Write a protein that binds this ligand. Sequence first.
Ligand code: PMP
Ligand code: PMP
Ligand code: PMP
Ligand code: PMP
Ligand code: XE
Ligand code: XE
Ligand code: XE
Ligand code: XE
Lengths: 455, 455, 463, 455
Amino acid sequence: ELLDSRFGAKSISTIAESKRFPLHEMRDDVAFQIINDELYLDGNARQNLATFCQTWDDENVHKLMDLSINKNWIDKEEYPQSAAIDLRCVNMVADLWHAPAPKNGQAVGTNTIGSSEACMLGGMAMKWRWRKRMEAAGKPTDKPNLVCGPVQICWHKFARYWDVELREIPMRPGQLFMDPKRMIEACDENTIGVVPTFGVTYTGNYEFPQPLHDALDKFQADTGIDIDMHIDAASGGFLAPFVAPDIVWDFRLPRVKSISASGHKFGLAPLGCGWVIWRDEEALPQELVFNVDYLGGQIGTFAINFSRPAGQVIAQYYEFLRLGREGYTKVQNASYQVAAYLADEIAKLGPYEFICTGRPDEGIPAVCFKLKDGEDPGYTLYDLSERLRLRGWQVPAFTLGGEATDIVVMRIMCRRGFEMDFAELLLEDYKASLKYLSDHPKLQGIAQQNSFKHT
Amino acid sequence: ELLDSRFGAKSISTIAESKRFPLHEMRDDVAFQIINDELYLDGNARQNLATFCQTWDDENVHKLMDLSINKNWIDKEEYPQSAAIDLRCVNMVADLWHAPAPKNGQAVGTNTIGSSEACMLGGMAMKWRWRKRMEAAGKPTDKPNLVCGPVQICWHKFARYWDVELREIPMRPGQLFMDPKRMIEACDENTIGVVPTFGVTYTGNYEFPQPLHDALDKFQADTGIDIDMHIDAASGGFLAPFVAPDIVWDFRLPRVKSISASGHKFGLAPLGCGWVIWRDEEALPQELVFNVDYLGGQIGTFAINFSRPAGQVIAQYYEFLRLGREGYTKVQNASYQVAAYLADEIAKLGPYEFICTGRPDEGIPAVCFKLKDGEDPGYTLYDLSERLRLRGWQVPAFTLGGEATDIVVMRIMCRRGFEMDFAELLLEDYKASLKYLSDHPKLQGIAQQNSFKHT
Amino acid sequence: KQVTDLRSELLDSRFGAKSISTIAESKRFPLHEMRDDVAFQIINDELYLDGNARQNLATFCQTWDDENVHKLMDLSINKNWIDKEEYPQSAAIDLRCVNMVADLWHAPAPKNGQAVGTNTIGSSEACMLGGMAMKWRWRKRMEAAGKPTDKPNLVCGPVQICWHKFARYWDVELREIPMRPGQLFMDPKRMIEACDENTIGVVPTFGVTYTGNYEFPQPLHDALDKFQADTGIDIDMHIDAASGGFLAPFVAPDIVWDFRLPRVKSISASGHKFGLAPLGCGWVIWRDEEALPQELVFNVDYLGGQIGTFAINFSRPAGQVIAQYYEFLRLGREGYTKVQNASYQVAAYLADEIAKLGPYEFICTGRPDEGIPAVCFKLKDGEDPGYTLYDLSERLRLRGWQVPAFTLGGEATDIVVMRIMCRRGFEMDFAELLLEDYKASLKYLSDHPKLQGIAQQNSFKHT
Amino acid sequence: ELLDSRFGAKSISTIAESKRFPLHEMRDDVAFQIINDELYLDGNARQNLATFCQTWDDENVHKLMDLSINKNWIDKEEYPQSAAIDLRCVNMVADLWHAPAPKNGQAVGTNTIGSSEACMLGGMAMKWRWRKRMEAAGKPTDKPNLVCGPVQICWHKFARYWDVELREIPMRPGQLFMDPKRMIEACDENTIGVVPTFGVTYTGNYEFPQPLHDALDKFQADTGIDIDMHIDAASGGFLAPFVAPDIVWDFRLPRVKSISASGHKFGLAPLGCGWVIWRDEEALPQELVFNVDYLGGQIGTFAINFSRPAGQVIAQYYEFLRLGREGYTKVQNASYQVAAYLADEIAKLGPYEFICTGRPDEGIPAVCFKLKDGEDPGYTLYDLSERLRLRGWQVPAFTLGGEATDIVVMRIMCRRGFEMDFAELLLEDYKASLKYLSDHPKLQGIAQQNSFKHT
Ligand SMILES: Cc1ncc(COP(=O)(O)O)c(CN)c1O
Ligand SMILES: Cc1ncc(COP(=O)(O)O)c(CN)c1O
Ligand SMILES: Cc1ncc(COP(=O)(O)O)c(CN)c1O
Ligand SMILES: Cc1ncc(COP(=O)(O)O)c(CN)c1O
Ligand SMILES: [Xe]
Ligand SMILES: [Xe]
Ligand SMILES: [Xe]
Ligand SMILES: [Xe]
């Protein structure tokens, strides 16, 4: 007769008969506690330096989210003020990225669940534009390809799910990104677009759309093939407009037909928010828009999702209102300041070569380094990653894709709430780890599992 | 210069600085109040009988959601307990639908944001299975079609986005649903699958998979053509297993390779929860599964979205645990009792012809009706709907699709929280409106806009 | 052949248990206990059918929420206003409010440091108290003069219902100066005509419920002076300043309406209107000890000696007084002036904007020197824009708004007006959105001419 | 230069600018803290045994009241559900007190802010009924009187405010309440009615209506004069129906035309809730009723107040619903158990004579006693009351009215939350005080201020 020390009663196991739908009722408050108690086993992510997504808490965001638990984004009739708020965000994000001022006062874009949806949506519209143009000219439309650099996994999914051929320019030592030369070599009249990554996941560096844009202009000159771009700005999109307004990467570039980003990365929204914006009505094929009947007349949607919570848009709106440009600038500078500082300090502690050092004009606030080629300080980065985990930190070590499959890097993400003091403390732990490693030479070479690298 | 009476300070208009990204910071607690006050203009949906989604509030769900605001469903490393709760639900749903007990102890399915993503996933798997089968028979794969009845807009989206021809059997009078005879005429060797809708959005009725299944068995006998099904049980999927276990619609049928439903409809989860289950490992082409690397190995996802909150899954788990089968039977029975009462009471109040009378063996808890042909009681259903809005209720009137385009109906949705007393009150207001329309005959015919119908 | 699995009793989807109905079982006192949390949920659930009043522009009462008012109210649920013994600190606070209000209205500085006045549940109670004391003063002056006291009358303009109640309940004849086109208010000429030696007082309404205009007490005061010079009859006033009472002192301190005028013997107003207190708070102040006849004061024994009360109510919560005190303290003259100005800004903009949308004649355009923050208008005479204000009201309800249209009293019973109340929380942005919905409705009414003339029920007009 | 230690800032005194309206703004949170701090000087009433009103806290009641802060009882249009609940309460109270089942389904009554207004209202209705009768008979209506026993102050108010001669039958030793003999001596054709008090404030005893009713029946036989009754059941009204249903005091007696009670006494509602119910339509002269226009028709009010919170009615409803008869019987008995106990136990502690010992068939849960005539234990009750204050308790010692002005009583009110355990502790403190008075004989005779005795 198994008992539970919590309830002073007969034990209900969650693991026994977690394989069948449960047969019986159980008191609501007991069910709540059992789950609540399980959840203590989840991490809080504050010491997690792998993830990009918002992990900090603001009481106001909890209140907005909690008011919004039942508020259906798709139901414009019942929730007309949430609907209004969503459209302001669309306009505000469009403005931020130099979208040509919209003819009717309303920018062409949509909120999404994350950058993943936002990319498939950008992806579909590219395909359709390329398909329309090619049928008009009487040509085969069965073999579209996409040209890009070391892209996030959403692009591999989009390519697979929509039968487009992924021409990914491989990462290679001393050329880790998509350069203009290799881009051009991979393009022809079946290329639907080119996708630069404005903040490479693996390393934190920017892929600068301008030099690529110039190559595509030249390419049109030489071949007559007119290629559009879509900027995956999952993280850059809410960084560069504030701390590096000089970098031309957005709608300021004529070939850029759409951009996407994550609200719930550096836009500071809570998990469950992305954005995609098109340059104008022509960037978005009408065949893709579905009009749904409501009382005030009908509205068009381009989204994969239908019903879903409006909480994250309202929270996004709250970030936008309370910070503005002036506010976001100070926030993102804070992060860059932390990244820079970690970068300089870590350089002093071993023979490291730095792929990314958290400068605002090169990428996102991220430190990314590898060991110097053919040097051996007595540990690998997997080893050091293991030591830091014992001190509560999740600092991922992993190998790159492509022809740089030989290279192991360590990458640190600096997000909101990882302030200068927690960086100090990481550093103390970092140093203590180097010390234990050197006191225990036997540890070398042992750890060999990659960590989660994707978001 | 303009002041605000809440703050006794210079006014900030959210409607003036609404077009561009704001330049200045504002005090957090003022942004919060500004937004909080706007959201009072949203409805609370408790008198809305137009929607399927949960709008009831339970204190434990709010707590679970609130703890879960940052829990990343995709980050199995940091949130391993959330990961575990998710997998449990997958098994529990599979079990509910009579999926073959799984070999390795883990059923084949995934959580989704809603039924929209669930259906595209199932839709994509149908396409690939059909493709693989044609390529083996050395036949062309360029003209896929999908056969179905009056489906929810997500299937129109699917067919557009993925280049499949939608053969929608049209609603017509005395013939609203996909019947076996009409289904068979639309089938051929390019049909990727047939999708019954187990709870038709427009009317509430079930399309019964079993007689369709018999027709497809006969169809393969006669032509050698072996057509699969995917059941869109958006609403029925959490009703029938409890209050009509003897309706054979699920994996008990060999042709049914996958099923989807909404957790946030009758599965009682909060907004942002959907499910899709496949019959077994072979129903899911591996080319569609993506393996992400993590510390404890690697898990395979099939999902359009990537990062996204885990609260909904956790809340769904709460509902499963606290109610079980005995609980859910009680809960759904309650809604059924309401709808059946409403249908009986309303029938006595006008010259009405009923398409759906809210019985558990016919469909979901919904009453759906139209005016009897050639009868004219001095008003239209649009008219009665507008009178009802004035007494706070949202009871939609709209026209059916296909050939029944001519037909106006009123459709009442009974969800959790809309209890017998509330139904009594609506009944009073309905009578009160009937009277006011009879006292003011000039009102007949004026209102003619369709209401939100789609979920 | 069955396929179902049903239970043979009525169930509730919330509780997965047997149904309990509030509606049958609403007829007799209930016989059985029920679980507390279930009782609570059943009730809380029903209350979602109440409006939140944010789009209700018919009411004067406070509808905005402020976290601190909620906490203060929540601490005070049990605090009994009448129980000076147990809640000496609440008693102190109440006394401070009375002084601050007196002070705000230029009451003569009290001899003993304590003004003569009381808190009440709302203006209704305030007014009966003012009316009672007026009646008693007059009764005594006549008894002194050995005259008959059985036929008292009260002169006033288009007043709120409470005066109709007071007049009935207390056997006083109501000489209401009737509203009529182009003279909607008690004017000096018609007031004088109604006045004789049984007039206990004249009651200017400083903020008319129906329209929002001020009846200005000073011209009336002048007439009443001239009237004494001619007849020797000495008539008192009492100002029903229900709403204007917490407006003019901040935005129009030059309008002479209060104790600055010697005939004004008491003033009443609502804290839970432009006072900004939460529902259930009024005030009445007497000029001095002599204005409140001792016969009306009841003395009750407490441990610290005895205190005198002039209240209709006895036991009652102190929350609103404390809440009112919070408002006074946190705002001051400086804060009120701002908060009040904000509301007048909304009214002025609505009035200037709405004027452009149809053929309207304006009774009140929300100007600080004319009345309260209210917009009140009627259709111009003999214009037919294609709808009545009743119809326009209806289309507005469908968009969530409650903007009343109702007929005026007296001889103007032939006029339909629309009135918009602008209170705290109804800010410029919300006024922008009303304007959009108003425009949308006009467009709907113009594309759908059959709607004209159909709607004809009066909306709630009184507070 | 003066500082506050709480805010480490320039001091604000509430005592300075308690004289004039304040000039300046302060920070909201500071204002709030200042006030909150002063409130700590208020008692919490748990040891106050002088009062009648509810002083116990229940979480649900707090939430309801807090939901209802803006809910306007008069505004039937905006808060239709609060209106509906109000009306149910009228019906439940009517039934409770054996009112004749109302014709049209709605009993004639109204909620009020307390017993005081409810008494005013019943009083006016009495004065009108007599007025109308007398006019019809062509007789003087200028000299109305009221006959009553030791009434609560509201009846003295009633009489002054409405020009009715109060004929209060005075208390006298051995005869403390209105008895039929003296009642009849005071009655005539100008008597608007007799008011028995069903739970006398000063003592706790019931004035029994039935023997008076017989006296009034006999009276009408001898003289032709027909005299109505109003019961003041401020406290008795929510006691006898549960623990003494046999006492015939209510609408079972035909001459009872109206009854009034406090919700916030033994009705268990929070402060600000009273009831008055009429026997039927005819009991309530239509002159007194005012019709206000709303949209759903028009409603009749008979109230002194106009705008006011609906929180308390709602709270009252919750108490009714959750408890019922069976609950109320339990709650009320428990209080009687306490007062019975105190009465037996105090009896043993000195030379006391009891006026009221907390028996259900005699009065409310109160103990009221005086020192035995010509007996001197060496203290007065005033002295005992003061000793008890020192140890936290408020136990009032006062003198009775009329011809018992020679008499000092102590009176203990036993209300909800003053449970057996607290009585026990009062007894301990009671014994210690007597011991202190015994050891310190000088203390005797010194204290002489009457306590608050009225509610
Ligand atoms: C470049 C890029 N694009 C897409 C994504 C996916 O974003 P989300 O998880 O917000 O859907 C990420 C995060 N990995 C990314 O770095
Ligand atoms: C049959 C069906 N399938 C798909 C959906 C879409 O579900 P969701 O809102 O969860 O995306 C609905 C609800 N409209 C539906 O009725
Ligand atoms: C002039 C006037 N008098 C008194 C009142 C009554 O006040 P209350 O609702 O606060 O009791 C009102 C509106 N009710 C009013 O506007
Ligand atoms: C018998 C009697 N009648 C009337 C009242 C007045 O009650 P309230 O304070 O609820 O107005 C009381 C309160 N002492 C009472 O006991
Ligand atoms: Xe869009
Ligand atoms: Xe999967
Ligand atoms: Xe007073
Ligand atoms: Xe009433």
